[PDB]
Design a protein around this ligand. Structure first.
Ligand SMILES: [Cl-]
Lengths: 235, 231, 195, 240, 243, 250, 111, 244, 241
């Protein structure tokens, strides 16, 4: 056939480029960083009404100061999350401190290109890694299967991403409050989702310095959806 | 064509297509410039952003107190190679109480890259590096290509539109080599060189990345408002 | 761990095991159960070096429970004892052997017979009417040689066991803090709570 | 060792070996899982191409992983044994180190992790198997039903089916299963499970197997005659 | 067809096409030569000045093995470096065990067997270099040239790279016109001339001459680079002959 | 410098054929004719010494090989593959049997071990099957005299008489007519020489024919005296002179 | 028998003030009743405003200080030139020391 | 590199089948028919040899029926050499179980182990599967008499009567027609030979062509006896049942 | 058609890679010959130094494997030296382990078994060489044993290898048909070398100078190669009768 680690004539790894196509097929995940916190939101996308939607775990805790949202082949993320959690806890053991969000992201991304003929193929999942540390404050990173990571003020990944990213382009400013960011994620999710947005097919989360990483209750998200509808009807 | 499936296969004209495709990834990468005098050596790098919400990808990596590089191409491969350089620099210090010569660092990168071009299963590194350093024989600038070819130079540039900066340096050769004991003027010449490779975009405060090493100057990177002086 | 006794009567096996756990100077506990249920009709008591005893017992337990799920079937007491013996016989030529002696009391549901096996840390297996490990047997075997009959009831087996425990309490130097007694029969395993 | 990357991405972002493993699951006999208020029932199809079978000794489709959790499957039978063995070992290992039996979610997550590992390991193909894992957590009376698949994704289901013509029985369950009021009793839950299989099975009672799992390690497999009574009552009500 | 797609596959001719394709990479490289003289050997190489930004005298191509052997090569420069690194390991283990420095014929076979090994399997690529090497041992001077196939012979004069035909013709005149032999200092001058004459094949870019030598009288049998006045004397001699 | 062939080179084709085994059998078919005949008091194995050049010393090339003192082998197909199998067969007779039980293996078990080696070349990674069929004749105390054929697949069958290679179809028909269960060893040798003459083109004498027997114990060939139980090898290779003697009574 | 340990003597002293700290050590290095050196520095600046001394067997002391200095260097590389806090340094030194739990660095360490 | 020559023996087709398993089954369909029939008081194993020659030494020959222990036997259909690799593994597995538990291995446990080995060759390693189908005939004190089959996929199932190898479709119809649950060994012997006699590709079924065996709990004093029939005994049972 | 790239069977039962390795044998275009005397074994081979820049002393296809064994190769030099080094290693290891010098025929067998492995194992290619081993063995006397890429080997009374082997072979065949003996009935090796050269001249139809030939001689307890001057003496004697 052809090598797994083969370069194309344009200078790209075939497998990495093909894994990026799998991520486009994934459900939408959106992150928005502010000075009051970082908000992470996801489309759940239950394949059937009999599937108990609360078991869809696409937002995940890495440490108390670092959260993570995923899009693509979500089964591939479990070993990445495991490594992240171990890296966070191991660094605390060796240094008696929280680990920097960038350092954690860099550790996850070191796994990415460990594939060949090590694992047999790249990961088919992109991660939004959101967190807080004392050095660089509130941060949002986009970790790909290329091994590259970009910091973002806001970022969307998954099937609605280019549409969502254009919307995040207009809407994001440096003075966003946490409450504003929550509504903004819900707004853009509702735009790019196929099914109508509610508390059962979408999930919110955030990371603040005081309270750490928290996945929002369905009752709490339901109130923010009702608050969104009223403020859009308001003009 | 038929001879580009893997790195282990020569073409009928004696070419290694996988290596040449890796070389192509560098040309797609963002521009970076290297240049030196007798006292100092400077790296100037145009960082690239994904969009307006994103950060600008870091181009410059420190290897030791007296050495570091700038990258163009696959950033994860630069991380692997820079880490290898960090270890070799560190091994020289711990075992021999000796700072690693910049020429010898180039030789080590060449040999590491070469092994990936001759063996099956592996791939070539998809990145080009500009290594600057100050050692016991003064300032140095190296250009690393992932074919294995490392080249000591007075100045150079790699990445997209790098031929504009490279021509400028070729004209300015006799001027900038004489900028001794003046770091700001050497950086100016590097910032003016990298400007020849720009189209549409210009050098903003979070776009530009500069590094410097010299006689009584450790390898230090300048980003953000530290480079506003040179815009 | 100090005293473990076993006695096979007509229709059951009775295992008595001391309650004391002593670490050097102090008696740390006086209610320790030195036994594991391997299957519904097979019980293993154990005594030997600290740590090794429980680690071995639980390791055997896990393997017998795994066999039970895989085959949906309980291994015979004979089969369990042969498994245990092999593990100990493998152990003795290891880098660090398990220093554990065991009694395996079981009711074979196929043959409708109680069975008592005595295995030491070397992997020396013997089927017996009554058994003991360590210094217990020095005092108790002469009693059991005198009083034992194969057709005894469970209540007679327990009375004979009281006489063993009284003799041990009279003549042994160490205070072993009494015994927990367990009966293995056709209905399974139960603990005699007053002894 | 044989290191060859068999599970790899294609230009459209699909891992064909994982998708072809799902086609093996589509070929497999139908399996269904329905959870009531205080029970879970696992129904399974037995294809009647094979008569002269010895039903005493033939591998049963529902397997106990521990005394409180069961696993049924659709797909390659030989592949399922490997997952069942690994799960049974992990169930005992969990009891040994945590001093507590596995939760149904934990056991599912483990089996799903194994399935995932085979989609990005060199030299191996994915399991041609999807599982339904059902039971009750220790000291808990809430029913649990999970599904896994070759890719390694897993999720919880009020009711679910897998295997051949699972599209049809999922159609049935989607209209007949009410979440606000699930099958209150064991009878109602078994009835709904038999009814759902009767859409596809197209034969009497030899082709249906039923296993009821209740709280506190109370698992029982129904016999032919017990199932045949449900089949009789369903069709007599249907004639109207 | 398809016999040229994999290394170590015999074509119906009995040829290994991948080795022959490696030779094309060698033929594409810059010119390098070797001259055997009375009591030693001289190595020289053409270094193409791609740009004015190249630092003069810094990008050294000729490599020393042990203290008494010089190596120069044409083709893929990293492949040459990999081969010299191996040569250094072979020369080190030989000295470690047998005390004496490795003889040149012995050293030649060590490289020869290693290069030949890379034509035995499809999991490796042949070397993209022809290597000219040699030095002074207990039996006197020896010059060798080693091809991608693992083939090597002893030489009076050797040449490889893009200007090899030009160089070979010039070497053949020296052999005919000096049967009694050539002195070490003569060979340095002639080496400079031959590289300058061979530069007509790479005439687009200007170049930098680099020479080294081992000689029993002139260097005590150790490998040294030709530097300063002796290098300039050879460049002047070469510049005079082309005009 | 890696062995990357960790996958089978012999695989099932859509029709259910194992191609490489069939092709190995085709190589055996091109090979020179060899045969085996079992008598009541012995076994004979025979083949043509097809000399590649008249300058070559065909005595040095042994197509008929001793495996144990009571077991011998002959082949048809590729000679180099046979030579290495004889080396492995001789060694396995010691390692997996004589060093354990203190006696040589019986014919059927040694055959089984050879068969196993050939089977493994049919399934292991990065190898082709052996391109030979063996005929193994031998004797042991509890089974008596026996003759086995071993194919590239690893399959083996016991024979009363058979032939393999070039003219095997014609030779097997010839043996069917002549074989009976009351043959003496000399009768079997006579039949072996008659059968082999049909497949041979050129010269037919003791120098171009190789022939060995598994027969009586040869205490003269033992090399030592003083142990009553060791009575000497049953395997004996007939000399060039011994063959020519029997060709006069032909 | 070869004894891998020795005793190079010396004494060290750390005192923590309100907004400062001192680490003192004598400069004598000895074996048995011989003086090796009258001035052999024992207390080292390790960077990041941390000072360290590993008194006892001088070979193990030097090895440890060397390794900790290197640990500071790699902390900078791996965590974006972040300053190693004294509490983090201390925990890192625990792992260096315990790493050789069954062939110890024969030293009393103070930072 | 080597990748070029790799058949990839352990992959799914687009339809979700294992190519090599399917082709191995095609191989097995050409092999000589083997039949197993389970009765209340014993099991019969009957099998047809493939290579009729007059010169084949039949009394010392074994291509079809092998002994695994004293309680369990197999009938082979496919590559004999492949089967012998697996048989020796199965023989060892039985003795390992006996050494560990001091009890004879239950039939299903031995069958599962072999079937698991076969499965492994279809999922990992890059090697071709074993081109073998087994009929396992055995007895243990849990389930009594048992018949199983395994095939190259590593799937196994239990049977009252079953065929493998050639003409199994025809053979399984004939068994399904004449089998009954209350049947006895002597009746099963007759059924097995009648089925082979009708499904055989040969002109007539003779003793020199057959391997035959019975497992009976009709040994002295309630033990189990494995009988591998000698050539003369196969000839006698052919005359008794009225086939020759 | 990958059955022609690696060493697996074609449908005809052929190994094409082995057959193409045999063709690589004649790539040098050199003919070799070996004959046996009473006390000696002589091997001669053509020597062609086409380039004037070559050091003719280093151009050789005859190798001293051990003191007693010599080896001439027909094929490319890299494969020739691969085979030479291995044979030297094997001969030395044999002496160490078993306490006597490796016989010529045993070495030939060992090298042939190694060659057989390359025809069966896919990852290793065959060497494109024919190895002709010569000695005066202490048990068997004058000995010639030849190995090829198939892993075949056999002893010889005399032999020839190369593009024009058939012409040399038939010339030797015809001489031994006359004499009716397995060897050259001659006391001194000098005259056996003269025979070898004469019968190659007759067979190939070409005259030789001292630099066109290369000669190896095996005697009891040593194998040695002749210098150009030793060959010149041989050529003078041939011309003078
Ligand atoms: Cl050998």
């Amino acid at each position: 056939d052809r090598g797994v680690s083969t370069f194309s004539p344009e200078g790209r790894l075939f497998q990495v480029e093909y894994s990026l196509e799998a991520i486009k097929l994934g459900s939408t995940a959106i992150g928005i960083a502010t000075k009051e916190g970082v908000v992470l939101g996801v489309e759940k996308r239950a394949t059937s009404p009999l599937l108990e939607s609360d078991s869809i775990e696409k937002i995940v805790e890495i440490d108390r100061h670092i959260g993570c949202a995923m899009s693509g082949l979500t089964a591939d993320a479990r070993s990445m999350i495991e490594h992240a959690r171990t890296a966070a806890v191991t660094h605390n053991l060796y240094y008696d401190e929280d680990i920097n969000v960038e350092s954690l992201t860099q550790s996850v991304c070191d796994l990415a290109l460990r594939f060949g003929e090590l694992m047999s193929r790249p990961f088919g999942v992109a991660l939004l890694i959101a967190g807080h540390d004392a050095d660089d404050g509130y941060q949002l990173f986009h970790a790909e299967p290329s091994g590259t990571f970009y910091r973002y003020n806001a970022k969307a990944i998954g099937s609605g991403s280019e549409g969502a990213q254009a919307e995040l382009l207009n809407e994001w400013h440096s003075s966003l409050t946490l409450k504003e960011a929550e509504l903004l994620v819900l707004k853009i999710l509702k735009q790019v989702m196929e099914e109508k947005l509610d508390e059962n097919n979408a999930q919110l989360s955030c990371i603040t310095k005081q309270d750490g990483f928290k996945i929002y209750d369905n009752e709490k998200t339901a109130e923010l959806i009702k608050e969104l509808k009223e403020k859009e009807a308001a003009e | 064509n038929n001879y580009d499936g893997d790195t282990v296969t020569f073409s009928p004209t004696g070419r290694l297509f996988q290596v040449e495709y890796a070389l192509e990834a560098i040309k797609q990468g963002s521009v970076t410039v290297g240049l030196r005098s007798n006292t100092h050596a400077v790296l100037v790098a145009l960082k690239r952003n994904a969009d307006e919400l994103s950060s600008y990808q870091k181009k410059i990596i420190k290897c030791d107190e007296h050495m570091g590089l700038s990258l163009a191409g696959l950033a994860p491969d630069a991380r692997v190679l820079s880490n290898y350089l960090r270890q070799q620099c560190n091994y020289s210090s711990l075992v021999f109480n000796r700072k690693l010569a910049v020429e010898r660092a180039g030789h080590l990168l060449c040999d590491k890259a070469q092994k990936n071009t001759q063996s099956y299963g592996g791939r070539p590194y998809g990145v080009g590096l500009l290594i600057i350093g100050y050692d016991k024989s003064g300032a140095h600038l190296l250009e690393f290509q992932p074919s294995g070819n490392v080249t000591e130079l007075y100045g150079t540039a790699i990445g997209a539109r790098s031929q504009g900066a490279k021509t400028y340096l070729e004209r300015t050769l006799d001027t900038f080599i004489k900028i001794d004991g003046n770091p700001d003027e050497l950086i100016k010449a590097g910032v003016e060189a990298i400007s020849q490779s720009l189209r549409d975009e210009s050098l903003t405060v979070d776009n530009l990345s500069i590094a410097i090493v010299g006689k009584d100057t450790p390898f230090t990177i300048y980003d953000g408002e530290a480079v506003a002086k040179y815009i | 761990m100090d005293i473990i006794l076993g006695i096979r009567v007509q229709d059951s096996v009775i295992l008595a095991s001391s309650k004391a756990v002593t670490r050097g100077i102090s008696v740390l506990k006086d209610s320790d159960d030195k036994t594991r249920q391997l299957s519904p009709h097979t019980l293993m008591s154990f005594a030997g070096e600290a740590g090794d005893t429980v680690q071995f017992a639980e390791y055997i337990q896990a393997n017998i429970q795994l066999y039970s799920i895989r085959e949906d079937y309980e291994l015979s007491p004979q089969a369990v004892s042969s498994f245990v013996r092999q593990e100990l016989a493998k152990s003795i030529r290891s880098r660090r052997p398990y220093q554990v002696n065991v009694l395996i009391g079981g009711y074979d549901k196929k043959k409708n017979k109680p069975e008592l096996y005595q295995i030491d840390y070397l992997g020396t297996k013997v089927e017996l009417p009554y058994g003991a490990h360590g210094y217990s047997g020095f005092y108790t075997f002469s009693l059991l040689d005198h009083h034992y009959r194969p057709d005894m009831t469970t209540e007679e087996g327990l009375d004979l066991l009281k006489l063993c425990v009284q003799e041990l309490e009279k003549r042994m130097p160490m205070d072993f803090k009494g015994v927990i007694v367990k009966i293995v029969d056709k209905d399974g395993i139960r603990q005699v709570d007053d002894f | 060792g044989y290191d060859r990357a068999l599970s790899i991405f294609s230009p459209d972002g699909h891992i064909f070996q994982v998708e072809y493993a799902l086609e093996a699951v589509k070929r497999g006999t139908c399996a269904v899982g329905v959870k009531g208020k205080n029970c879970v029932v696992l129904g399974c199809e037995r294809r009647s191409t094979l008569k002269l079978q010895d039903t005493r000794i033939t591998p049963s489709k529902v397997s106990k992983i521990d005394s409180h959790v069961v696993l049924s499957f659709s797909g390659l039978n030989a592949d399922s044994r490997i997952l069942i063995e690994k799960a049974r070992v992990e169930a005992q290992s969990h009891r040994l180190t945590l001093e507590d039996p596995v939760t149904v979610e934990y056991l599912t997550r483990y089996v799903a992790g194994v399935q995932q590992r085979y989609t990005q390991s060199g030299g191996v193909r994915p399991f041609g198997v999807s599982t339904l894992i059902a039971g009750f957590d220790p000291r808990d009376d809430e029913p649990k039903l999970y599904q896994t698949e070759p890719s390694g994704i897993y999720s919880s289901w009020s009711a679910q089916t897998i295997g051949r013509n699972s599209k049809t029985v999922r159609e049935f369950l989607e209209k007949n299963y009410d979440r606000k009021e699930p099958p209150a009793t064991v009878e109602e839950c078994v009835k709904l499970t038999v009814r759902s299989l009767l859409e596809v099975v197209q034969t009497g009672a030899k082709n249906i197997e039923i296993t009821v799992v209740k709280p506190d390690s109370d698992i029982v497999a129904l016999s032919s005659e017990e199932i045949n009574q449900y089949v009789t009552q369903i069709e007599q009500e249907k004639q109207e | 067809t398809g016999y040229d797609l994999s290394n170590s596959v015999f074509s119906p001719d009995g040829r290994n096409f991948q080795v022959e394709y490696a030779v094309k990479a060698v033929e594409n490289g810059t010119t390098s030569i070797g001259i055997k003289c009375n009591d030693g050997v001289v190595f020289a190489v053409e270094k193409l000045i791609t740009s004015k930004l190249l630092v003069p005298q810094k990008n050294v191509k000729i490599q020393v093995v042990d203290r008494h052997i010089g190596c120069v090569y044409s083709g893929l420069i990293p492949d040459g470096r990999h081969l010299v690194n191996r040569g250094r390991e072979e020369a080190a283990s030989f000295k470690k065990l047998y005390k004496t420095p490795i003889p040149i014929p012995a050293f030649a076979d060590r490289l020869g067997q290693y290069v030949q090994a890379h034509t035995l399997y499809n999991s490796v690529r042949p070397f993209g270099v022809s290597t000219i090497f040699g030095g002074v041992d207990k039996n006197g001077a020896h010059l060798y040239m080693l091809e991608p196939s693992g083939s090597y012979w002893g030489y009076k004069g050797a040449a490889t790279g893009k200007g090899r035909q030009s160089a070979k013709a010039e070497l053949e005149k020296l052999v005919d016109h000096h049967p009694e032999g050539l002195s070490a200092r003569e060979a340095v001058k002639q080496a400079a001339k031959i590289i300058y004459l061979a530069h007509e094949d790479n005439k687009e870019k200007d170049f930098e001459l680099e020479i080294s030598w081992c000689s029993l009288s002139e260097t005590n049998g150790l490998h040294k680079f030709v530097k300063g006045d002796l290098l300039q004397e050879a460049i002047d001699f070469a510049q005079k002959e082309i005009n | 410098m890696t062995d990357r062939y960790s996958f089978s080179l012999t695989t099932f084709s859509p029709s259910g054929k194992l191609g490489q085994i069939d092709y190995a059998l085709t190589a055996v078919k091109q090979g020179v004719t060899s045969l085996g005949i079992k008598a009541t008091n012995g076994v004979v194995i025979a083949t043509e010494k097809k000399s590649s050049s008249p300058l070559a010393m065909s005595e040095t090339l042994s197509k008929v090989s001793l495996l144990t003192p009571d077991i011998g082998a002959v082949y048809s197909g590729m000679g180099p593959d046979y030579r290495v199998l004889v080396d492995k067969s001789r060694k396995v007779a010691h390692t997996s049997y004589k060093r354990i039980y203190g006696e040589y293996p019986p014919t059927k078990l040694l055959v089984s071990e050879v068969a196993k080696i050939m089977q493994e070349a049919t399934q292991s990674g990065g190898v082709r099957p052996f391109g030979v069929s063996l005929l193994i004749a031998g004797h042991d105390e509890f089974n008596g005299f026996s003759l086995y054929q071993v194919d590239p697949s690893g399959s083996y069958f016991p024979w009363k008489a058979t032939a393999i290679g070039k003219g095997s179809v014609a030779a097997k028909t010839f043996l069917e007519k002549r074989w009976n269960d009351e043959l003496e060893l000399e009768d079997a040798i006579h039949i072996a020489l008659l059968t082999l003459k049909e497949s041979v083109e050129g010269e037919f004498n003791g120098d171009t024919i190789e022939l060995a027997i598994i027969g009586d114990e040869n205490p003269d060939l033992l090399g030592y005296t003083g142990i009553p139980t060791d009575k000497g090898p049953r395997f004996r290779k007939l000399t060039s002179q011994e063959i020519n003697d029997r060709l006069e009574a032909l | 028998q070869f004894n891998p340990y020795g005793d190079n003597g010396g004494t060290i002293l750390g005192i923590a003030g309100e907004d400062f700290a001192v680490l003192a050590g004598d400069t004598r290095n000895i074996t048995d009743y011989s003086i090796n050196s009258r001035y052999e520095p024992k207390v080292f600046d390790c960077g990041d405003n941390i000072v360290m001394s590993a008194n006892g067997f001088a070979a193990d002391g030097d090895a440890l200080v060397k390794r900790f200095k290197n640990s500071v260097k790699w902390y900078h590389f791996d965590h974006n030139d972040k300053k190693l806090s004294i509490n983090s340094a201390a925990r890192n030194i625990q792992h260096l020391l315990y790493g050789k739990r069954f062939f110890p660095y024969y030293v009393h360490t103070i930072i | 590199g080597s990748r070029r020559y790799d058949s990839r023996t352990t992959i799914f087709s687009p339809e979700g089948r294992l190519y090599q398993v399917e082709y191995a089954l095609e191989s097995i369909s050409h092999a000589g028919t083997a039949i197993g029939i389970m009765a209340s008081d014993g099991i019969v194993l009957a099998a047809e040899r493939k290579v009729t020659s007059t010169l084949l030494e039949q009394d010392t020959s074994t291509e079809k029926l092998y002994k695994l222990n004293d309680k369990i036997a197999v009938a082979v259909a496919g590559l004999t050499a492949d089967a012998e690799i697996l048989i020796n593994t199965a023989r060892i597995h039985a003795q390992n179980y006996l050494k560990t538990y001091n009890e004879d291995i239950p039939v299903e446990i031995l069958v599962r182990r072999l079937s698991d080995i076969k499965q492994g060759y279809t999922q990992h390693g890059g090697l071709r599967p074993f081109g073998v189908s087994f009929i396992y005939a055995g007895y243990d004190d849990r389930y009594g008499y048992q018949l199983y089959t395994s095939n190259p996929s590593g799937n196994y199932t239990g049977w009252k009567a079953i065929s493998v190898g050639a003409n199994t479709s025809a053979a399984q119809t004939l068994l399904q027609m004449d089998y009954k649950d209350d049947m006895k060994v002597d009746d099963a012997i007759e059924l097995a030979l009648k089925t082979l006699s009708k499904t055989t590709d040969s002109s007539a079924l003779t003793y020199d062509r057959l391997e035959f065996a019975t497992i009976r709990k009709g040994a002295n004093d309630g033990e189990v006896y494995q009988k591998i029939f000698k050539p003369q005994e196969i000839k006698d049972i052919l005359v008794k049942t009225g086939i020759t | 058609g990958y059955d022609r790239h690696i060493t697996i069977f074609s449908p005809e039962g052929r190994l094409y890679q082995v057959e193409y390795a045999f063709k690589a044998t004649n790539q040098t275009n050199i003919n070799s010959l070996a004959v046996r005397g009473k006390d000696c074994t002589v091997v001669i081979s053509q020597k062609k130094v086409p380039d004037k820049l070559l050091d003719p002393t280093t151009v050789s296809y005859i190798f001293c494997i051990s003191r007693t064994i010599g080896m001439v190769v027909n094929g490319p030099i890299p494969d020739a030296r691969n085979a030479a080094l291995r044979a030297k290693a094997e001969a030395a290891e044999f002496r160490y382990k078993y306490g006597y010098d490796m016989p010529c025929d045993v070495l030939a067998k060992r090298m042939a078994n190694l060659s057989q492995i390359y025809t069966q194992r896919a990852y290793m290619r065959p060497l494109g060489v024919i190895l002709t081993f010569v000695s005066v063995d202490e048990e068997l006397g004058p000995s010639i044993y030849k190995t090829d890429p198939a892993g075949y080997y056999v002893g010889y009374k005399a032999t020839a290898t190369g593009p024009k082997q058939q012409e040399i072979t038939t010339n030797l065949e015809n001489h031994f048909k006359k004499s009716k003996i397995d060897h050259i009935n001659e006391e001194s090796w000098e005259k056996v070398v003269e025979f070898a050269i004469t019968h190659m001249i007759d067979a190939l139809g070409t005259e030789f100078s001292k630099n066109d030939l290369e000669v190896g001689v095996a005697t009891k307890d040593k194998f040695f190669t002749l210098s150009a001057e030793n060959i010149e003496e041989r050529l003078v004697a041939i011309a003078e009768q």
